[PDB]
Ligand binder design. Structure first.
Ligand SMILES: CCCCCCCC/C=C\CCCCCCCC(=O)O[C@H](COC(=O)CCCCCCCCCCCCCCC)COP(=O)(O)OC[C@@H](O)CO
Ligand SMILES: CCCCCCCCCCCC(=O)OC[C@H](COP(=O)([O-])O)OC(=O)CCCCCCCCCCC
Ligand SMILES: CC(C)CCC[C@@H](C)[C@H]1CC[C@H]2[C@@H]3CC=C4C[C@@H](O)CC[C@]4(C)[C@H]3CC[C@]12C
Ligand SMILES: CCCCCCCCCCCCCCCC(=O)O
Ligand SMILES: CCCCCCCCCCCCCCCC(=O)O
Ligand SMILES: CCCCCCCCCC
Ligand SMILES: [Cl-]
Lengths: 33, 193, 51
């Protein structure tokens, strides 16, 4: 087994950034009067 | 304009609930899955460990990952720091599940009150998750963690091992929890219009 | 306090308080079933699939 963790961390950071960016879109819809 | 504002507020509330459920899923997954820290090529023995659970290899060119640890039995947890971190993460999970339960209160109670209740409870869950993530490294100086990772490890000293997906997902959960708390606060203060 | 809302005017309510405890039975009609269902969802997922 290749004992490296980059693709795993890559997908984890990707989904995390996706959820975070969705929440920033929620802020964008919110603060916009 | 009023109907547009009402539709936007309703949609943002629904999406906030969806993201709250997603963050609860994240909190449960990081609490359960033992992939907070992981071996490396320089590690003498292969294995990993979470908040409380830990699997280690025997070291005979095979996996044979003997797995020990359980939050339900505090004796098996390697260190007091691990116990405190696991307790804080459990408390955060309880808080977010409590807000998911309090979603039902939108039927009866005023929307501002329920929004602010989950705002405060998500804030407390975020602080508990921060405390757990800050206290968890203190137990790296435990004898079994040192044995697995190596002698270089210590309090706030990763050494040879590497942080795996669960720890970074927990950090993402902290960020998402703080964000959801702020979103709930602003939604509660905005629905009055 | 941009919104003129301080840490007691924006975040925490501190309004009135409770008063509406008379209809507290109505909350338990939905609160108790939800918490137990939520408890079952992660109790069984934790032991059967995740670990
Ligand atoms: C696997 C995970 C499972 C987790 C699921 C756990 C289930 C949790 C329990 C119940 C959820 C449903 C609750 C629905 C409540 C929504 C009820 C509602 O819409 O209320 C109205 C406000 O709308 C509003 O803007 C409030 C909007 C926010 C609502 C937030 C909850 C949405 C949940 C929708 C589910 C999405 C799908 C998720 C499935 C994965 C006004 O009301 P009403 O004038 O009459 O009086 C209120 C007072 O002010 C005066 O009496
Ligand atoms: C064996 C399982 C049987 C379950 C049968 C459930 C049928 C319940 C239908 C609800 C009927 C209804 O809406 O009227 C009751 C009250 C009316 O409002 P108010 O009088 O509380 O202000 O409504 C409410 O305010 C609270 C309604 C609570 C609904 C959730 C019930 C959950 C039942 C699942 C138990 C496993
Ligand atoms: C009352 C509502 C709002 C919240 C309920 C919280 C529930 C879901 C919490 C409280 C205690 C938790 C348990 C505490 C300890 C363990 C041992 C671990 O090895 C698997 C998860 C498991 C079994 C947890 C599952 C979730 C749990 C049952
Ligand atoms: C179990 C049911 C617990 C109900 C909790 C109280 C809900 C909010 C009560 C009113 C809040 C307010 O002061 O406006
Ligand atoms: C209706 C409210 C209760 C909601 C909770 C429903 C789940 C009850 C638990 C039933 C035990 C099921 C056992 C599952 C394990 C198995 O059979 O292999
Ligand atoms: C796919 C893993 C699912 C883990 C359980 C999620 C629990 C959500 C609690 C509402
Ligand atoms: Cl266990």
């Amino acid at each position: 087994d290749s004992r490296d963790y980059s693709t795993e961390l890559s997908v984890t950071v990707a989904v995390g950034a996706s959820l975070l960016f969705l929440n920033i879109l929620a802020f964008a819809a919110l603060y916009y009067k | 304009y009023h109907e547009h504002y009402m539709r936007n507020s309703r949609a943002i509330g629904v999406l906030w609930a969806i993201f709250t459920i997603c963050f609860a899923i994240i909190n449960v997954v990081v609490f359960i899955q033992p992939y907070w820290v992981g071996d490396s090529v320089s590690t003498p023995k292969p294995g990993y460990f979470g908040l409380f659970h830990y699997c280690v290899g025997s070291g005979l060119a095979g996996r044979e990952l003997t797995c020990r640890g359980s939050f339900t039995d505090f004796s098996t947890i390697p260190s007091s720091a691990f116990k405190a971190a696991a307790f804080f993460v459990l408390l955060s999970m309880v808080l977010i599940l409590g807000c998911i339960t309090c979603f039902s209160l939108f039927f009866f109670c005023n929307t501002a009150t329920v929004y602010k209740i989950c705002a405060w409870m998500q804030l407390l869950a975020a602080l508990c998750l921060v405390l757990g993530c800050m206290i968890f490294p203190d137990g790296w100086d435990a004898e079994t963690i040192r044995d697995m990772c190596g002698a270089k490890t210590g309090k706030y000293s990763l050494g040879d091992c590497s942080v795996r997906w669960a720890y970074i997902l927990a950090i993402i959960g902290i960020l998402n929890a703080l964000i959801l708390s702020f979103l709930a606060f602003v939604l509660g203060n905005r629905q009055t219009d | 306090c941009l919104d003129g809302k301080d840490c007691a005017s924006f975040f925490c309510c501190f309004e009135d308080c409770h008063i509406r405890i008379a209809k507290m039975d109505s909350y338990a009609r939905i609160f108790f079933p939800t918490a137990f269902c939520l408890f079952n969802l992660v109790y069984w997922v934790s032991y059967l699939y995740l670990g």
